[PDB]
Amino acid sequence: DAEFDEGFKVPGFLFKKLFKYQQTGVRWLWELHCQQAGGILGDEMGLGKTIQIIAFLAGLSYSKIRRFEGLGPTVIVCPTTVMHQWVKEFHTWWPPFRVAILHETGSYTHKKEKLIRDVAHCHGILITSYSYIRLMQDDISRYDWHYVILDEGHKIRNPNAAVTLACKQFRTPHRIILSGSPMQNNLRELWSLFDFIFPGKLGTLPVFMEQFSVPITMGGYSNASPVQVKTAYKCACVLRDTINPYLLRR
Amino acid sequence: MLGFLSARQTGLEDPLRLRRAESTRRVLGLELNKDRDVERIHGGGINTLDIEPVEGRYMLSGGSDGVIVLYDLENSSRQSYYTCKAVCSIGRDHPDVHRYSVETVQWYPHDTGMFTSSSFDKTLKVWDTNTLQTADVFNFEETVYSHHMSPVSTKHCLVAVGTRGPKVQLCDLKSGSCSHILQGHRQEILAVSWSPRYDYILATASADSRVKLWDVRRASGCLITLDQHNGKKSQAVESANTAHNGKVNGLCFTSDGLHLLTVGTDNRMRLWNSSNGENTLVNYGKVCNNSKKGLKFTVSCGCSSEFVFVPYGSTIAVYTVYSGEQITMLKGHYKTVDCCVFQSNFQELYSGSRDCNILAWVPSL
Amino acid sequence: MSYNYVVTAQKPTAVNGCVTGHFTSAEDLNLLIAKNTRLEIYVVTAEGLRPVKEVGMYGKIAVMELFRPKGESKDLLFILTAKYNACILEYKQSGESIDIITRAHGNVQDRIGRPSETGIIGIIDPECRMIGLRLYDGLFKVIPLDRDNKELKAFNIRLEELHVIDVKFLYGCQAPTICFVYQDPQGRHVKTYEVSLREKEFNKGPWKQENVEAEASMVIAVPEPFGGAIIIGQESITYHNGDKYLAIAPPIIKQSTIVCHNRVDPNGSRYLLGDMEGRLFMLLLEKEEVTLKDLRVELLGETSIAECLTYLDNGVVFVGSRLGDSQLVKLNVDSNEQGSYVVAMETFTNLGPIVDMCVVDLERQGQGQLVTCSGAFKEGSLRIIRNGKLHIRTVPLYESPRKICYQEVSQCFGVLSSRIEVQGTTALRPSASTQALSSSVSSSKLFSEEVEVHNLLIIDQHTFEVLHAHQFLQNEYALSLVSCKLGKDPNTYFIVGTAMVYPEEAEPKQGRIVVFQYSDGKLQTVAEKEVKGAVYSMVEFNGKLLASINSTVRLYEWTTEKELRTECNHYNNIMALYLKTKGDFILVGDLMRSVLLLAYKPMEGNFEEIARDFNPNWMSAVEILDDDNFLGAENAFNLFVCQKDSDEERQHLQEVGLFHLGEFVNVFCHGSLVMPTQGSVLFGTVNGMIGLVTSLSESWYNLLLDMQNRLNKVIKSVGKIEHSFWRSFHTERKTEPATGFIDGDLIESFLDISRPKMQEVVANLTADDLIKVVEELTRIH
Ligand SMILES: Nc1ncnc2c1ncn2[C@@H]1O[C@H](COP(=O)(O)OP(=O)(O)O)[C@@H](O)[C@H]1O
Ligand code: BEF
């Protein structure tokens, strides 16, 4: 087995399967756990973020760390096309997990609220979609989930979409975002993502916009004077420093 | 004293015994030293004092006139009488001088070369001691009541800043990041203090009668909200769990960092368990404060019994932390006392006041 | 920078802790003795003790306890160091070779914490599930053992009681259960907690808090048949098992406090209890069929003042004393016709608290010869030390010696002694003051439970018999004592500085300087001088008497009338405790301002504060090495050398030397015990170490520092402690690496290693050169 700083072991076979950067990522996820912070697995598409997440969750269940003993009831919110991709990857990589789908397709065939209840009370992985998170926040948030992995979490990039407000209703500290592109049109999207994983770091959207978005943007227009370019460089350095501990982007 | 010397020399008692019992004797004998004076440089009331943690030689002072004074507390003259001369001063002609009252000044822990000061001009300025020029300025939208650097953080260099805003600003001196905010208070934060024990534990006290303990690493809000009664009056937390029945304008961790002392405008001082925020029910009597800003008070260190020196109107009231028994009240100021700071090497106290004086209290004999 | 070489002339002799167990083998019964930095392993033979190993820890052994984890063949040893180096050591004998392997180690110092008043406690669960350490107020550190560490990861449990006197692990409990006495304003109480290593926190103990005697200071965990605990206070011994409350108040234990204990049996039917007077008691538990019926205390006899005591077997008890010689006594079944069952089998020399010492070239040789005030109340004595190894004579004084000076012209030693009288008053025992040839008492016109009587003993420097004993006034404490000739008259005087000690005050306001002359077997009082404070120190200073009354250092002159007349004063001191002299310069060691270089400018007739060290070091002793190098000893077991630097910053002494000795220096003195190095300063410590500081040149200092680093890279310490960490200057508010000081012990260990290890040392420097160097270095002591 591979052992990390405090009590976190990941099985030797599960660990051997991973690559060097994926196990760096499993480490990084677990320091996030130790500090009770969220973060953005920003490794770009195809590098394997499902596997780092599954390996970390498996080592979280396997290490029996101490409220929840090991892994609690976690929710994975993903685009509708990959819910079954997630189920497949969980069943091949860590079969002991109970991985339910919260969808019409699903596999349950009873009241969905019953599925959410059962997964909350048997510490399963509930795989749902962003649409369902919007529609069933009344039920999805009455159960004190242990992790709130959002796959392709850049669907949270609009701070005012209903999905965004919904996903920001989980009381848990262990929020994770999987998105190889956690910035798509502007810095407001980055603020929204970081406001999900760690609400305070970037300030209120007032402060973030005035301190970072207007400066960092205004130094990229072609006509930008040198002074304003240098301000943009300075503010970009500050922003990268601020978000360094919580973004892992290979 | 001769019994103590004989017991030390012969090994009966650990030398720690003599150190602590004698330091306690020196604290009980603390009295206004007219055999030491501090040079008057402030045109306004002294709001804050900070003796450097390493070597305890130099003192900072922030006045209501916006000047910062840097004093030498070592008696470099061969006389038994000396005045603590003012080495430096950020004066009315200094281009970086604060435009309004300096409400807090703090040495950088771990090194004397940098110190930080916050003002009602809505700035926290970082100063390089040697060149005495600002290295950084953190502008805030609202006037600063109190800032504090962790006395312990070998890892992070965050400054917790409390302004009239309901949020606590965390400013990273390492690459300048003033975006982090701790939200959960509802009124002006009148006092902030990092735990001396835990690198990332911050205690914040606000005019809404609430004191909160935070883990600035954590992404899930305040750890603890101090409650007077510990559950006797229990309510779904929307307005209850107040530390005081007024504004809480002073915070001070005990030396070992296992307890928290709060003073509020209910004319009370309370002692709390800093791990679970449980009131220890130490009485302390009545502590007259009606300060409308942060009230800086200190504790003793390395004595047989710990003490707390709290500004009590124009006097400095000395209490035993863990029994509440008021040792005494040091009366030598002419107006209300704003701040006291303890020199832990010689059990000396310095106290500033609105009467534009800084008085040294040294043990008698 | 200063270049100083520290070495041990006499290793510490005071036994600060001793345990018994099966450490070297499952069948051996070992006696492990902690003298401050030395761990001495003996085998309990049918007669005496056979030494098997003596190791040097890089640490003051604060805790030392043997424990046997499940499956282990023989006892492992847990040691905690004063600097909080924890280690678990195992003894592995491979034929001739002997090793002490470190089964685990770590540093458990909390960065912050108020180190507890009563001092470092270290207990081990009777089932070896955890090591409980009370190091700081309000915290209780737990080192798990079931989670088999190699780094000793430990966690704090917050203890709701902040003033814990003593704590033990109870027996016969499914959970690790601690029982401790703590003091709150409402009195002293005994409380129990159950330790949860899984929850990492306390739980409600088996039996709730109980209000106990006011001076309850000892907890004794009692083995499984009885269970419970026995709390010893001053006037009572009480037994708690949760529902049972036995309580006795034996009148025989009221006279002195019980300070150490030991379980004679495995079943705890008998305990030894040692008190500060040196009495030895046997506490008997009478069982009922099993419950406990009643407690009995019987006085076995007297021993040396025990710090620790251990019952070995067959009535043999090792009484490890810090204040007197350690003892190996026998407990007879029948009394000795004097009421005593204790019979001393063997005595182990202990240069006890060395409170003062002098180097006299007695026998008119070229050899120095230490004479030290060793020991304390009943164990006080003069020890005479000389090379021949070191031979140690003992002159039992039977009372605490305090100072000693040699008057050569008169062929005598003047010794300040102190004896404790009870009632007007009565001597508890015949003390060397009371058996002098002649005697006298101070009849002075200046000033008009148990008390301390102080005498000036004139002792023959051939026979070491008390030629004379002058008792000082009632409630007069003699502190300082100098032998010298003053002014221009030719008589050599014994000058004693005293203080008047009344319980109504914390610092004496009254005292006097008495000038005696010893001639014709009598001690005449030649002069007196009422001073307004305690005379902590007097040095003869260029024909004049330089005394230090409470906070003033003043210089007296000896007038033609033969009286002391003040010449100058100096006041900028908290407490001038230590005075030294070299030429016109006076070094003042303060209670807490630490050193001051004063100059008597004779052209004016007043003092001048030349330089000062502004660091807050609480001195225990001071010395002048050179014109500008000032050795000092802080009460945190550190040596530092100050140096007059090279404006007003010239009034700042520069601390150019720093070194953690691990011993409490009580005295420095120039001299050498022998017939490359410059100067030679001996020092005597509380533990009984005699060490030697001397000045090196820059070249050799560099060489020896290089080889120090090499030996650190090669020699492996017992608890895997780093030498640099051990010698690092340490105070509760400061910590710096050593500098300007070479551990002569580590250097001299360069001989006790095999030749391949030597080449490992001597890679880039030949070896035989350094063998010559280190031999020449050992020549100095
Ligand atoms: N260490 C690995 N060993 C074997 N297959 C892997 C490993 N890492 C990733 N994969 C495979 O690579 C594919 C792409 O990874 P995926 O997690 O979908 O990428 P993303 O990081 O964009 O989510 C997955 O189907 C997965 O099975
Ligand atoms: F490649 Be995707 F971000 F899973």
Curated annotation (Swiss-Prot), chain A:
Q: Which organism does this record belong to?
A: Homo sapiens
How does it get modified post-translation? Phosphorylation at these two sites promotes the intramolecular interaction of the N-terminal domain with the helicase ATP-binding domain, thereby probably releasing the inhibitory effect of the N-terminal domain on its ATPase activity. Phosphorylation is essential for its chromatin remodeling activity.
Chain ranges of the Helicase ATP-binding domain = 30-200
Query: Which top-level group of life is the source organism from?
Result: Eukaryota
Q: What is the protein named? A: DNA excision repair protein ERCC-6
Q: What does this protein do?
A: Essential factor involved in transcription-coupled nucleotide excision repair (TC-NER), a process during which RNA polymerase II-blocking lesions are rapidly removed from the transcribed strand of active genes. Plays a central role in the initiation of the TC-NER process: specifically recognizes and binds RNA polymerase II stalled at a lesion, and mediates recruitment of ERCC8/CSA, initiating DNA damage excision by TFIIH recruitment.
Copy the domain comment. The CSA-interacting motif (CIM) mediates interaction and recruitment of ERCC8/CSA. A C-terminal ubiquitin-binding domain (UBD) is essential for transcription-coupled nucleotide excision repair activity, interaction with RNA polymerase II, association with chromatin after UV irradiation and for mediating the UV-induced translocation of ERRC8 to the nuclear matrix.
Report the subcellular localization: Nucleus; Chromosome
Residues annotated as binding ATP are: 43-50
Summarize the impact of residue 96 to A: In a colorectal cancer sample; somatic mutation
UniProtKB/Swiss-Prot annotation, chain B:
Superkingdom of the organism of origin: Eukaryota
Q: In which pathway does it act?
A: Protein modification; protein ubiquitination
Do you know which Pfam families this protein is assigned to?
WD40
Give the residues annotated as coiled coil: none
Its keywords, alphabetically, are: Chromosome, Cockayne syndrome, Deafness, Disease variant, DNA damage, DNA repair, Dwarfism, Nucleus, Phosphoprotein, Repeat, Ubl conjugation pathway, WD repeat
Naming one, the record's GO cellular component terms include: Cul4A-RING E3 ubiquitin ligase complex
Specify whether DNA repair is a keyword of the entry: yes
Write out the GO MF terms: ubiquitin-like ligase-substrate adaptor activity
Gene3D superfamilies xrefs = YVTN repeat-like/Quinoprotein amine dehydrogenase
Which InterPro entries does the record associate with it?
G-protein_beta_WD-40_rep, Rad28/ERCC8/Ckn1/ATCSA-1, WD40/YVTN_repeat-like_dom_sf, WD40_repeat_CS, WD40_repeat_dom_sf, WD40_rpt
Gene Ontology biological process terms in this record: DNA damage response; double-strand break repair via classical nonhomologous end joining; positive regulation of DNA repair; proteasome-mediated ubiquitin-dependent protein catabolic process; protein autoubiquitination; protein polyubiquitination; regulation of transcription-coupled nucleotide-excision repair; response to auditory stimulus
> Membrane-spanning residues where?
none
WD repeat feature ranges: 33-73, 88-129, 133-173, 177-216, 235-274, 281-321, 325-363
Q: Where in the cell is it found?
A: Nucleus; Chromosome; Nucleus matrix
Subunit description = Part of the CSA complex (also named DCX(ERCC8) complex), a DCX E3 ubiquitin-protein ligase complex containing ERCC8, RBX1, DDB1 and CUL4A; the CSA complex interacts with RNA polymerase II; upon UV irradiation it interacts with the COP9 signalosome and preferentially with the hyperphosphorylated form of RNA polymerase II. Interacts with ERCC6/CSB (via CIM motif); promoting recruitment to lesion-stalled RNA polymerase II (Pol II). Interacts with KIAA1530/UVSSA. Interacts with a subunit of RNA polymerase II TFIIH.
- Name it: DNA excision repair protein ERCC-8
Task: Give the originating organism.
Answer: Homo sapiens
UniProtKB/Swiss-Prot annotation, chain C:
| Pathway note | Protein modification; protein ubiquitination
List the residue ranges of the region (WD repeat beta-propeller C): 389-696
Residues with PTM Phosphothreonine:
766
Q: Which GO terms describe its biological process?
A: apoptotic process; biological process involved in interaction with symbiont; cellular response to UV; DNA damage response; DNA repair; ectopic germ cell programmed cell death; epigenetic programming in the zygotic pronuclei; negative regulation of apoptotic process
Note on domains (UniProt): The core of the protein consists of three WD40 beta-propeller domains.
What are the entry keywords?
A: Acetylation, Biological rhythms, Cytoplasm, Disease variant, DNA damage, DNA repair, DNA-binding, Host-virus interaction, Intellectual disability, Isopeptide bond, Nucleus, Phosphoprotein, Repeat, Ubl conjugation, Ubl conjugation pathway
This molecule's function is given as:
Protein, which is both involved in DNA repair and protein ubiquitination, as part of the UV-DDB complex and DCX (DDB1-CUL4-X-box) complexes, respectively. Core component of the UV-DDB complex (UV-damaged DNA-binding protein complex), a complex that recognizes UV-induced DNA damage and recruit proteins of the nucleotide excision repair pathway (the NER pathway) to initiate DNA repair. The UV-DDB complex preferentially binds to cyclobutane pyrimidine dimers (CPD), 6-4 photoproducts (6-4 PP), apurinic sites and short mismatches.
Query: Region annotation Interaction with CDT1 and CUL4A: residue ranges?
Result: 447-781
N-acetylserine occurs at: 2
Taxonomic source organism: Homo sapiens
Q: Does the keyword Cell division apply?
A: no
Region described as WD repeat beta-propeller A: 13-351
Which protein family is named in the record?
Belongs to the DDB1 family.
Family matches, as SUPFAM superfamilies:
WD40 repeat-like (SSF50978)
Q: In its keyword annotation, does this UniProt entry include Disulfide bond?
A: no
The entry's comment on post-translational modification says: Phosphorylated by ABL1. Ubiquitinated by CUL4A. Subsequently degraded by ubiquitin-dependent proteolysis.
Disease implicated: White-Kernohan syndrome: An autosomal dominant disorder characterized by global developmental delay, variably impaired intellectual development, hypotonia, and characteristic facial features. Some patients may have genitourinary and skeletal abnormalities.
One annotated GO molecular function: cullin family protein binding
* Entry-annotated residues carrying N6-acetyllysine: 720
Under what name is this protein listed?
DNA damage-binding protein 1
